[PDB]
Amino acid sequence: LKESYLEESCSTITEGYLSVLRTGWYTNVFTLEVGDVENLTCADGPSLIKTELDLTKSALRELRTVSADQLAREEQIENP
Amino acid sequence: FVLGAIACGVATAAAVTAGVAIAKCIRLESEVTAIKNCLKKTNECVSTLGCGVRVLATAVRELKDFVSKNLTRAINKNKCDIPDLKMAVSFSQFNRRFLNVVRQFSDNAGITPAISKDLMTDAELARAISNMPTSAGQIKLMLENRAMVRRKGFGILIGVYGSSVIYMVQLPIFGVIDTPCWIVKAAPSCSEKKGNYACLLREDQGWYCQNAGSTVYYPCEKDCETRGDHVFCDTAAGINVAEQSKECNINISTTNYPCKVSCGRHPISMVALSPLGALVACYKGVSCSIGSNRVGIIKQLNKGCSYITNQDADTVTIDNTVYQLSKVEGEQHVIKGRPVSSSFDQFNVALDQCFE
Ligand SMILES: *[C@@H]1O[C@H](CO)[C@@H](O)[C@H](O)[C@H]1NC(C)=O
Numbered sequence: 038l039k040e041s042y043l044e045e046s047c048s049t050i051t052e053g054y055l056s057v058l059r060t061g062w063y064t065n066v067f068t069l070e071v072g073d074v075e076n077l078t079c080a081d082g083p084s085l086i087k088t089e090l091d092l093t094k095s096a097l098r099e100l101r102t103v104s105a106d107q108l109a110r111e112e113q114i115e116n117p
Numbered sequence: 118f119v120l121g122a123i124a125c126g127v128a129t130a131a132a133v134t135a136g137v138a139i140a141k142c143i144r145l146e147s148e149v150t151a152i153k154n155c156l157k158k159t160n161e162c163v164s165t166l167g168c169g170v171r172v173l174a175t176a177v178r179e180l181k182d183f184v185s186k187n188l189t190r191a192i193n194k195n196k197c198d199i200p201d202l203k204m205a206v207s208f209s210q211f212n213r214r215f216l217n218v219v220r221q222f223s224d225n226a227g228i229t230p231a232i233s234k235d236l237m238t239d240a241e242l243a244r245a246i247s248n249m250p251t252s253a254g255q256i257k258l259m260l261e262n263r264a265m266v267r268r269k270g271f272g273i274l275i276g277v278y279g280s281s282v283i284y285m286v287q288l289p290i291f292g293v294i295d296t297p298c299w300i301v302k303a304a305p306s307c308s309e310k311k312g313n314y315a316c317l318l319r320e321d322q323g324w325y326c327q328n329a330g331s332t333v334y335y336p337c338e339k340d341c342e343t344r345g346d347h348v349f350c351d352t353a354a355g356i357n358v359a360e361q362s363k364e365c366n367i368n369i370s371t372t373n374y375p376c377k378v379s380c381g382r383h384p385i386s387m388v389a390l391s392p393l394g395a396l397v398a399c400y401k402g403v404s405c406s407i408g409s410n411r412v413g414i415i416k417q418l419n420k421g422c423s424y425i426t427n428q429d430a431d432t433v434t435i436d437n438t439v440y441q442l443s444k445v446e447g448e449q450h451v452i453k454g455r456p457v458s459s460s461f462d463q464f465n466v467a468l469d470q471c472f473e
């Protein structure tokens with residue numbers, strides 16, 4: 038690179054860069070398949086599988102409400 | 118208006134606005150089911166939505182397959198304290214991506230700041246880059262710069278449909294590469310007499326890229342980011358400028374172009390960190406110094422504009438703000454000249470208007 042200090046204008050210009058310009062957006066849609074996890078239940082108390090299953094059911098139910106919240110926030114991104 | 122004062126944040130809002138509009142289209146029942154029907158017999162799909170946008174569609178089925186083919190038959194009779202250690206460990210390994218996708222979308226209210234490995238693996242990142250509407254030179258560059266692709270992309274949550282978590286990732290298409298590019302920095306050049314200041318400041322700071330016989334100007338320098346000799350630029354807040362405007366970098370007074378400046382009587386001390394050094398505008402009211410990390414403070418700087426190369430000193434301080442000089446090495450020129458300020462409140466005007 039070459040940097041030039043312009044004493045007549047208290048400015049610099051640095052040259053020698055090669056561009057990488059974002060000209061567009063490519064959309065990748067994902068379907069993450071969790072399976073019929075909400076129809077499974079552990080009736081025998083504390084357990085490693087019970088803990089993992091409750092994390093999974095909990096994460097599913099939380100994303101549903103996160104999604105709803107997003108629909109109001111997307112209104113504000115478009116209609117402030 | 119004043120371009121540098123309005124341009125930042127613009128390219129970001131355009132990306133979000135563009136993504137949300139695509140997300141709205143994907144959330145329709147006809148498009149969700151079309152995408153779901155595309156992926157019935159395969160893990161990967163390409164398709165054009167009703168609104169015209171091309172999407173690559175990817176199914177991630179490890180967890181669903183573990184749940185269908187191992188966990189369910191093993192938890193017949195609704196008992197989970199079974200002595201199957203590999204089942205519990207496999208369950209924990211197979212659901213961690215999902216749990217990480219939920220945390221990233223929950224913490225960010227449905228729009229992530231980047232592309233995490235849980236939204237997109239390296240394998241999947243390479244697959245999508247391969248499908249981008251660009252040529253081999255760009256794809257080769259992008260595959261060698263996946264960290265930058267992740268940093269400039271983002272995800273948007275589509276919704277939950279049954280057991281199916283649907284989301285979209287915007288990846289940056291770097292469609293134009295290796296054209297000449299340069300960055301302009303500036304600070305207030307100000308003359309002093311009778312306690313009175315006569316200031317000048319350039320109002321065309323930022324990044325410039327000569328692309329396809331036409332020069333483009335990116336006023337918000339945060340829309341561009343360097344890796345070595347490469348500068349990665351969002352083009353959403355780009356603006357064409359005439360070829361002659363580069364003459365402001367050798368003769369601010371040229372008649373071939375009305376170089377944009379701001380001239381006033383209110384100096385603002387500041388430090389403009391440049392790639393190979395720093396610009397330092399130091400005036401009455403604040404103190405400025407440069408230093409090395411081994412021997413303490415080098416010297417106090419004189420008032421006015423000083424150009425400190427990143428080899429003259431490792432640090433520059435203005436008042437109590439401390440800036441780290443770059444460590445890059447390069448050709449450093451001082452183009453000598455009488456400061457135009459010493460020849461003397463307008464804003465973003467041609468320089469010949471500052472003289473009257
Ligand atoms: C699940 O079952 C299938 C066959 O039904 C088997 O190939 C696979 O190894 C099992 N997975 C685990 C993690 O045990």
Ligand SMILES: *[C@@H]1O[C@H](CO)[C@@H](O)[C@H](O)[C@H]1NC(C)=O
Nearest residue numbers: 367368369370371372373374
């Ligand atoms: C800069 O341009 C002006 C007018 O175009 C001219 O008077 C002046 O001599 C030029 N200076 C240099 C160094 O070219």
